[model samples]
Target: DKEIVEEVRKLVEEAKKRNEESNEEVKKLVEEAEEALKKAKGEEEVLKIAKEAFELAIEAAKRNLKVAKEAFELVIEAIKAITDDEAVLRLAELAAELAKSQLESLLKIAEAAMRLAASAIKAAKGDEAIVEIVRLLVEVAEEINKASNAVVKFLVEVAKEALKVAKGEEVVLEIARLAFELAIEAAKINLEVARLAFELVITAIEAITDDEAVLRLAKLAAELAKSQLESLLNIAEAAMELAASAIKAAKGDEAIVEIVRLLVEVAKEINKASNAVVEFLVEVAEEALRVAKGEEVVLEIARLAFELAIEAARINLEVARLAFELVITAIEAITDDEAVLKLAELAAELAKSQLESLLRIAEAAMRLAASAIKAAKGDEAIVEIVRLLVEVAEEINKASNAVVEFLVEVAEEALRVAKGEEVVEEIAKLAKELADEAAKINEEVAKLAEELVKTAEEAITDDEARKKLRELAKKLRKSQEESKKRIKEAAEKLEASARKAAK
Candidate 1:
């Protein structure tokens, strides 16, 4: 505020001496500049006073060119007075004031603004200063790319240079974000600049092993390269690698949930992504089963990954194969139950995505789910896994023979732990629902549920559960005999009869 503030104060005295010669219009301009200078205290007002001085110089050129020249020089000195860490915000703001001026000074202020921005990345004391610099850079349409490239190159230089003087990983994080944030706005606007940007984030993550930070950088990295498949893979690899490191250290339910959340974002930004991403998600579910604190975390991860898996698998075929691994992985972390149940719900939803392929995921996932059920031993645990498998049974009402075989295996698994009256009772109802859905599509599926119901009736102690099982047992038999070559005809009659009587 001193040099610029005092010089403008001096120029005000000259314009006041030439009051009449200064022209009343010039007098008014000088009046505002002097008032702004007098009231200035901190950078906020100091910079505004600097802006007032620059505006007056542009106006003063008409009355006294020598004084205008001196004032113009002071405005440059005004901007130069604050040049390091604290200078970043003011310089950025100053650059903005100049951006709309439509003057040759733009190139000068743009260059100065970027230097402070480079310095800003390494000395991050506040929110990103990225918004203005791009606004400033884009204003010069004549050589915009070259100017942006120059600034982009400058930002990355500091990202690397600061790593030498860096005290901790946070600096690396700041650098990664500084570039990625720019990359998000710069993609397709300048490919070389974006490539440099993409490289800096991947490099930053490589040195860092902090779990949460890596997850975030990888997440921010998600928005970087969506336009080019080739660009997509480079960023995808960075996310996968950083994510692998993140999961390597992460050990709780929250981290597990975040991993799924991260994949959710990553899933949307990518196109026909590699099985590597799908495998990584499954591996996270696999890791959760071992390392995550609660059964709830594993289940939550599984349930969320169901969407992660389904949405990601929607992109490619091998991804479809890898998506089912979550179903199998989910079964490994059972007892908490809802996670597995929710996952099974998604599995049914996913079956609609890739029917023939998911049959394999279902076949293996159910087989493993059966084993998990047997080991769980608690009647409640067994019933839940049974419910999940049965839920998949309805979703699969695809009517394939393989689907029938999986339901039958599910039936056997149910009988193992459906020992409680309540357990067998719930399992019995699920089997009937499975049977009801199957009867419309495949007779074999309908018959498989009949056997499960008969076994449920044998084990059930509650009169109500037993009564329901026996009724379903006989009803499924009748339907099996009743369904003929005219499958649609049978399905129509059944639905029409129910629609009228149904509440």
Candidate 2:
């Protein structure tokens, strides 16, 4: 009250001075205070002035308080009169209190809207509708998340939606898992969101095979969304297997081809996925081949299988070898020159570390040469066979004697199939070169072994020196063994590569 009086009195002075156009009511209060101060007299006069001042102050305070209270009350009434007819506030309240229902309703709305969005997407014939759909979905989620619990539900729904998109393509399926996990975390309290997110991902990805989109989605989901997606890979594997089987059963070459393509895409995608995912994808690819059989299908299967081998070669040679087997199967199925040549080139690439597999490849090449000879007949086939034999001989020149001998046998068979001496001179030249290279490699291996021993002996003499010597000796032995193994492998590969080059 006193503070109000002081405020009013200050305003009164301001009004009297007409400073900056003071309010008329304030001026009136100033006049009343001045009149009360003028009529006072004595101790009684001083008391009278004080009393009048106090009374004037009280009267001014009451008047001002009444006016202020009325103004505040009017503001209250105005506020009370306003209606949130937009339902924005009511929506917020409901969302906060009943988020699950809100989310379900929103999801249904979005599902319906998706149809329109899809139409827009088709009409736009571009990425705009897709972007719009994404934006709308995220906004809808945020709106539903007006309640904390709704946030989780919204996220779960979003994840489920993402998974659904990913189902048809490996790339999309891979992407959707992460989106789902992200939604789950948006509503995250603990592992429940993660579990639900994983389930959503699993369900979404259940119909997919080796698709690039799905692969991308899986990688993204696993790395960026939630770790739970990693756990759902089994689901993906099972789905892919099912799809592969169905395609195999349908005997639809197109579907099988697509399956192969999908598997390859998925393989590429899973390159960044967890190791388990990569392995699972590899198995899926294998299964697809198991179901689909034919020259074209085999070629695709082989191509993908080879690719997987190369990819797996980074981690395990055995897996790479397995991939090579598929390639061989594919190659055996090939009757076309272009396809055989392509497979040969691919075999060379895979041969970098797959020496043993290259042997199988070489055998397949010989068979192909025999087929070519039979198909072309007489001079043409003989000429081609000679050239192939020459190439095979030269390639084998890089191998040990045993491998070269084996390759010579294969070349003889090719020649017999061709029924000609047209390739004899070329074959003899290659054989001579092979013999010379093998001798040279043997000499080099002996020299390397001797040098390694000398280096070891010289390197270790004192007690510390003796220990160093032992270590060097150990290393030298290992190196020699590795070198010998490599030399043998080189001989084998040389024959294979030479055969390919000849062709």
In order, candidate lDDTs are 0.36, 0.33
The per-candidate count of clashes, in order, stands at 0, 33
Q: How would you encode candidate 2's per-residue C-alpha lDDT over 1-503 as one tens digit per residue?
A: 23332343343343323311212333454345345434432222333332333333233333333333333233222223323322222222222222232233323332332232232222222232223322332232222223223233332332233232222333333333332233223223222223332332333233334343233323323331223222223222322333333232222233333333333233222222323333333333333334332333323333342333233323223223333343343434444443433433333333322333323333333333333333332342234233433233223323333333443443333323322233433443444344455455444434433443343334333455445445544644454355456555544554563454344
- Residue-wise lDDT of candidate 1 within 1-503, one digit each (tens)? 44444554454445335433433444455455455545544334434443444344334322233433343344344444533323322322232222112122222322332232232222222222222222222222213233333333333333333333333343333334443333223223334333333344343334333333333333333333222223333433333333333333334433333433343233223322332334333333333333333333333333443433333323333233333343344334333333333333343333333333333333433433333333343333333333444444443343332333333334333333333444433433343343344344444444444444443344445575555445545554554444433333433433343233223
Using lDDT as the measure, the top candidate is 1
| Candidate 1 structure lDDT | 0.36
**For candidate 1, what is the total of clashing residue pairs?**
0
User: What is the lDDT for 169 in model 2?
Assistant: 38
**Sliding window of 10 residues with minimal summed lDDT for model 2:** 87-96
